[PDB]
Symmetry: D2
Subunit: 205 residues, 4 copies
């Protein structure tokens, strides 16, 4: 594994206790410093393992390692999107996107309001069985149309023609210390710290 | 939905705090009374929705409902197996199976010792990505041979030729409040409260 | 299993040899009379097995049978959609949808042309690994937006908010006798017998 | 991509028509020269795309490429195992393994006879939904115990502790031209040309 190929834990634009009372410092410290750090390490080790196996044409090891690449690679990708679409109330968290922005105009055209889109997303999040994510996505092929999708585990939006706009973590570790089994309460509460300014930038990028 | 079709939460043969210090009373209370209760209700609701859709030949609904049958039905089966293979130390929890038993003799012949089987099982548990279970299984068609398998979410040992001997819950709700992100500490801890008398009885049935 | 819950092979609105030179009579005869027939039988048997097991509250059998419900129920639904969106050239097969119809207006707004939408679908069909389908779908929640999706095996469009508009069978049995390994030639060829009038009715329904 | 990393189509130890009347020369010709060639080319293309994406830390592409590595790498491993465990009758195809061999002794001890194991394998094959494989496997951690498992599409026996002994292709391209929809006729016929000498050698390795 070379220095240019290795990934690192991203710097987070807000303090660990800044999402309170919606997401605790206790969850954020473990989520970033233990959970995200595990995917950073897992990806860098999986890449090192893969180059060694590929070089030897060990197709049995190559095949086995692919799953760890997908998982740790996806975990890093999902969590990085997550931290960037979260913001304290003081820093624009929970402020709806500007209705004149490309994203704001698209939400209005397809859903009528951000309120309805959030209801549709909370609905997808409730239906997730096990570990997974919900994403608000832009499709670059069908006129920049928005849709809400879910992925299992650390699976991500990897289709070249699709753009992740908002990423919501539904893994039990994302809410358990504060909400316990009451997953719908976390889903309802998170929107108060959602960074829609980042979502607008992602759409127009 | 007829009454004889409806499932119920089982009686657990130990107090909420009886598996301490290995599994907290806080975890068991939520695990039994919130988590397992949700699988009981979900299954009964899915069977009712299924019968209506099957009666109307509404195959689009039928196909959608089958996922909730699988998830909730599996959730009930898995947690029921789990409580039955958990026991307080004073009630034989953690006590290794009699080497003279059908299960005991099979463990010795295949793995040499219970400790080696536990080592294998803990490695399979460590490898679980996202929500899932590990099972020690008996295969009825290959000479009652044991193996260690894992399932995702609430998938269970449903094949008629396979018998679940030990079920270990690897979902984050099974350990998070006590062990947080340190899932290997939980997998190591659990064996101290595993009911091998139940596993011996499952092998012989 | 009752008489009202039983599914049957649908009547086909075209002669077996009427899709030639695009799809042969030889494929069509096996496709309808052996393949679709096997899903009709599989579903009716799975339903009979399900009522027996649900009644006995045999969660292990109930869980096992769900897979057969999904598969044969999906196979019947997918094939029924398929025959309805196929038509001889003499009966409107290959005729692009009317641009003033709700579907035609949506295609123009989102993709610019039917040809561009066909190119996107052919790209999705090319990327299917193993057995599966491609569908042009309408989403009732995001403003009636169209999208191209794939499913594996006999998985279908079962989400209540989604409508299958066009179903394209990519299983090897759908083309093998005529095209052999040359799967892209079949994908290119099938559009000449696609019934877009059925697609228009499905969108407006 | 470097030379040492590139895979090649293997030499097949029997003529295209050598397995007749069990597997036609038309099937073998396409299976080796079109189907397996597509896996060889696809894997080499995926390794090249992977190295470029890994080099520029483009994790979105990396995560997307992993599936093509798994599919093509698995496709090459599976077909290579397949040709090696196929033999013309005049070269010992269909001849049961020596009961004195390590494999032979293991079959007798677990299944009683090769015919009972074949029956078990044929039932697992019949149960495959869509594209997949059945494998007779040796587990190196539970006493070298044999079992029968199935994989979907081009998924393979990649776990380090498991050894594939016999691989059977259940994709429609493996039998369609000759057996059409009657897949059980193919599963029955294949055992007449299975190379058990290779299976014994795999077990002992
Ligand atoms: Mn997370
Ligand atoms: Mn649980
Ligand atoms: Mn078909
Ligand atoms: Mn093949």
């Amino acid at each position: 594994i070379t220095e240019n190929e290795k990934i690192s834990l991203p710097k987070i634009d807000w303090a660990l206790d800044a999402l309170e009372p919606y997401i605790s410092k206790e969850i954020n410290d473990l989520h970033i410093n233990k959970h995200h750090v595990a995917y950073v390490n897992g990806y860098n080790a999986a890449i090192d393992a893969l180059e060694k196996a590929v070089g030897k044409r060990d197709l049995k090891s190559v095949v086995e390692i692919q799953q760890n690449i997908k998982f740790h690679g996806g975990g890093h990708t999902n969590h990085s999107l997550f931290w960037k679409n979260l913001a304290p109330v003081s820093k624009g968290g929970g402020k709806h996107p500007d209705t004149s922005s490309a994203l704001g105009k698209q939400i209005v055209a397809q859903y009528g309001s951000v309120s309805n889109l959030i209801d549709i997303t909370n609905s997808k999040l409730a239906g997730i069985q096990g570990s997974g994510w919900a994403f608000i996505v832009k499709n670059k092929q069908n006129g920049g149309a928005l849709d809400v999708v879910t992925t299992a585990n650390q699976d991500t939006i990897s289709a070249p023609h699709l753009v992740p706009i908002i990423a919501i973590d539904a893994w039990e570790h994302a809410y358990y210390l504060q909400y316990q089994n009451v997953r719908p309460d976390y889903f309802k509460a998170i929107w108060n710290v959602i960074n829609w300014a980042e979502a607008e930038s992602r759409y127009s990028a």
